[PDB]
Amino acid sequence: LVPMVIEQTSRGERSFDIYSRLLKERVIFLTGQVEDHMANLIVAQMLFLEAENPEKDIYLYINSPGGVITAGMSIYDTMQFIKPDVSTICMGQAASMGAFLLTAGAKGKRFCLPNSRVMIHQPLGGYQGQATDIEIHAREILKVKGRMNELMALHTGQSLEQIERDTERDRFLSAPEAVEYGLVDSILTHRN
Amino acid sequence: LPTPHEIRNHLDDYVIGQEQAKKVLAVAVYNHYKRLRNGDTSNGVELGKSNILLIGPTGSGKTLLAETLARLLDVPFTMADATTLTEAGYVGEDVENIIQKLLQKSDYDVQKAQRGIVYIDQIDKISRKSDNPSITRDVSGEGVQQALLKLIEGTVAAVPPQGGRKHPQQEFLQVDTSKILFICGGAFAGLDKVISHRVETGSGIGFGATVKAKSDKASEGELLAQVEPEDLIKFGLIPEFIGRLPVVATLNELSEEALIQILKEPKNALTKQYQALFNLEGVDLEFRDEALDAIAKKAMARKTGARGLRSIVEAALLDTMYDLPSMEDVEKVVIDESVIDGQSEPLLIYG
Amino acid sequence: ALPTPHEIRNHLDDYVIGQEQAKKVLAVAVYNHYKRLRNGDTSNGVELGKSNILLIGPTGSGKTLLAETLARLLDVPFTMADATTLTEAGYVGEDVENIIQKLLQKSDYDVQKAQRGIVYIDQIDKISRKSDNPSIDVSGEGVQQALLKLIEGTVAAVPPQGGRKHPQQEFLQVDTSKILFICGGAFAGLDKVISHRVETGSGIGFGATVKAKSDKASEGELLAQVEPEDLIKFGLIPEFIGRLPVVATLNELSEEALIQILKEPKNALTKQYQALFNLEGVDLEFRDEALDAIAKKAMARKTGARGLRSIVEAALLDTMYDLPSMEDVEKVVIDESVIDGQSEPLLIYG
Ligand SMILES: Nc1ncnc2c1ncn2[C@@H]1O[C@H](COP(=O)(O)OP(=O)(O)OP(O)(O)=S)[C@@H](O)[C@H]1O
Ligand SMILES: Nc1ncnc2c1ncn2[C@@H]1O[C@H](COP(=O)(O)OP(=O)(O)OP(O)(O)=S)[C@@H](O)[C@H]1O
Structure with missing residues (x-):
């Protein structure tokens, strides 16, 4: 269920859902697996906020175990294309794709909660058919893996060689280690 | 001739805790005497007159200063009000009434009246309700500010001398206002809300947004200290009128x-x-x-x-x-x- | 001989800065006005037209300063009136003919010398038309109609000196077809009307352009793209604007x-x-x-x-x-x- 709240304005009282109220304050929620429907919905939210105000920071909270790669890459180009600084926060967990959108945020505006956890690994796939077709899909997924590692190094600042060794298998990174790894900037322990 | 310290010493007897406001008025009084006392036939000509805008909470002593100032002031002084003023010669009142009221204190001396001082209480009442120009023509809002523009800058206005014995005379006297000083001040309502939006961005719910630490924060007094003309534009005042009033005092x-x-x-x-x-x-x-x-x-x-x-x-x-x-x-x-x-x-x- | 545009403009440069486009317009009008009346006018060209200037400018840009300095250099009579006190249908506030009676005070009641005078009016924006009409707009559309007769050229009754008593009961006629008028005032909110036209909307999509910057369409650069049709939406009647072909924009x-x-x-x-x-x-x-x-x-x-x-x-x-x-x-x-x-x-x- 979704609770309804009331926002008081000069014109009068208006009823909004909890998700719509936060959207009015430039806050978007990324929950569950990353798919084509959830991803295509978030892009429309980002664009809508750009037109209303292109100079105010956007906040993106990520709590997801990851999902499809192609659905997530549409969001990466969108965050980089628009002028506003997309602030990212990690709540609960950030898998391979969830971590890529986390680090893709604006430099200096990336935070992680004290008990959050990040996990990164290589792309997963598979194919069944003739050997000629397997070679095609293998070369394609290999370029993505190479492309995803280059961008990871660009935002994290580490070298491409380091990303290659750390992404060969699943690698869990606690919240403090993320700061030391260059993935994030600080931790929002308490309110100041 | 009177010194800022001497004039301020007298006001200190009747007013307390308004050190900044007293300085503004003292300089104006000294400047006003200085402007008029000198022949003005110098290399610099048409010396500017800096008007005063008083802002402060309710009952802080704005109206009290005008009364005490008139006692020590030798030149004529008047205490008018912006509530009754109506533009375009309506039935309510005219802008020339302020000048006509001055002559009663000055005994109908035009040369002596131009050097007088004027005070207008409750200036906030004529402020526009909304930022955009009113759809209708306000007779006690924006319209009044427009008519004061040419008055504060300097112009000539018709003044019936003595009211006239009968219709026989049907004439008016012309008096200048280029040299007249104006003290327009009133406690503005809701000004703190406008300055908060522009001083602290805030107004967020998320983690990154900085919600007010306490329920009681950003006190009314502090906000006035950081006031600027642009804030008054959202309040309703026209930039034209504010330009005529460069100085902006503050009463804690x-x-x-x-x-x-x-x-x-x-x-x-x-x-x-x-x-x-x-x-x-x-x-x-x-x-x-x-x-x-x-x-x-x-x-x-x-x-x-x-x-x-x-x-x-x-x-x-x-x-x-x-x-x-x-x-x-x-x-x-x-x-x-x-x-x-x-x-x-x-x-x-x-x- | 009468001064040249370079000499008259040089004088304004001493007191005004950053109004090169406006200075040329005023100098030409002044030069034309002196040139128009100085000649008998019984030449190949007859009934020469009078160009009326409309000065639009942001707050504190120097509009009122030009009229004051302009009056000093010129010999002909000059007046500085205001559109705030004007009332239509001869109410108690003020009449449009009062401007003429005030003009004679400067000219010492010389009709032939007064027709060659110059007029300056400020706060013209205050007399704009309002869509809502709750009243019983004395300072709006009514004032515009009364001025039209003055600008087009006609005679208005003016009691000379006010008269000693009812005995005289006469008025002097002073033509206005030859008199020049400079009606200008800082319009408020005009940028928004022009913005809707030139902005072309703000599409939310990728290809559509949005207001990337906080500010855009700078007032100085925006007023240059002003046209008469835009002023109609502001409230002015086209007939009144038609009488003022010239327009000057100030940064x-x-x-x-x-x-x-x-x-x-x-x-x-x-x-x-x-x-x-x-x-x-x-x-x-x-x-x-x-x-x-x-x-x-x-x-x-x-x-x-x-x-x-x-x-x-x-x-x-x-x-x-x-x-x-x-x-x-x-x-x-x-x-x-x-x-x-x-x-x-x-x-x-x-
Ligand atoms: N500094 C002060 N010292 C002593 N009494 C004061 C002082 N300021 C205000 N008062 C009292 O407040 C009364 C009214 O002060 P006002 O000058 O009317 O304040 P105000 O700012 O003008 O409020 P408004 O805008 O006129 S309602 C005076 O008669 C005094 O009794
Ligand atoms: N170019 C300028 N050079 C020097 N001083 C200027 C200039 N423009 C404006 N000023 C100053 O501004 C004062 C008033 O200028 P105005 O001519 O009144 O401007 P404005 O466009 O008429 O504003 P409004 O519409 O009358 S409120 C002058 O007395 C000068 O002190």
């Missing part, structure tokens, strides 16, 4: 310690008023220091300034004043701190 | 222009305050580093040159309060830090 809100001084140092304090009220009755009055500290806590709670101070005193002395005339052989009255709270009765001294 | 203020305004003009505030302290036996100096900072603070107030005194008086306030009390003070120096308030103005004793 009253503080608990200031009120204690207001009851003893000023000559017109409430303590001295009632003391004189009973003096003719052959009865004395006393107010201990312990009683004043409790009264200060109660006054600020009313969010009304010094004008809301009488409510605390008179509510206590209500019963006392009712029984004293009937009573006989009463020579002195003492009001301790407990009486203010209402848990005790004032002590009486008999002859 | 609000240029950071570099402000620096010149404090030194080159004779009536600059620096020269005003300098003379203010000269009689007190104290000199004043202003470093160039201080004027650059004042410009940034002035533009932030969005009030034009008129909003400059607030920045100066805010600094010298403490000084002027303690300066008369102080003795043996011969010179004052103002640094850039003094404007910000971090430092205190320096003094030199003797």
